[model samples]
Target: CTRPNNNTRKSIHIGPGRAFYTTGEIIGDIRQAHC
Candidate 1:
């Protein structure tokens, strides 16, 4: 549960499965670091 600080590497904790992220979220960042 976290958000990006900039266009750099970030650490995230996704579930034990594939994570799908949508484009143009209300926030100004994206986290699709899963497959």
Candidate 2:
């Protein structure tokens, strides 16, 4: 998938591997409790 915009916010890597990109802005928000 392509980046919606060049805004360059954050990154959420989940499930599988290298396959990335796609989810646009419109967020809610938290962090990795472990971090």
Candidate 3:
């Protein structure tokens, strides 16, 4: 899932071999937990 704003924080799933973008000011990668 994806959230377009900061007020509503949520997790996003970017499949393997895929790419995604997040608004500036936020840090960390969704894939780090798996890495």
User: What tens digits encode model 2's per-residue C-alpha lDDT throughout 1-35?
Assistant: 33322433444454264234333332212222212
**By lDDT: ranked, best first:** 3, 1, 2
Worst window of 10 by summed lDDT in candidate 3: 25-34
Q: Against the hidden reference, what TM-scores do the models get?
A: 0.18, 0.15, 0.16
**TM-score for candidate 3, residues paired by index:** 0.16
Clashes of 2: 0
Summed backbone clashes in each candidate are: 0, 0, 0
lDDT of 2: 0.33
Misplaced by over 4 Å in model 3 are 1-28
- RMSD per model, one decimal: 9.0, 11.5, 9.6
Report every candidate's CA lDDT.
Answer: 0.35, 0.33, 0.36
Task: Estimate, for each residue in 1-35, the C-alpha lDDT of model 3 and write its tens digit.
Answer: 23333342443445363344343323343333333
By lDDT, the best candidate is: 3
For candidate 1, the clash count comes to 0
lDDT of each residue in 1-35, candidate 1, tens digit only: 34362432342333353143323331335444221
Residue pair clashes in candidate 1: none
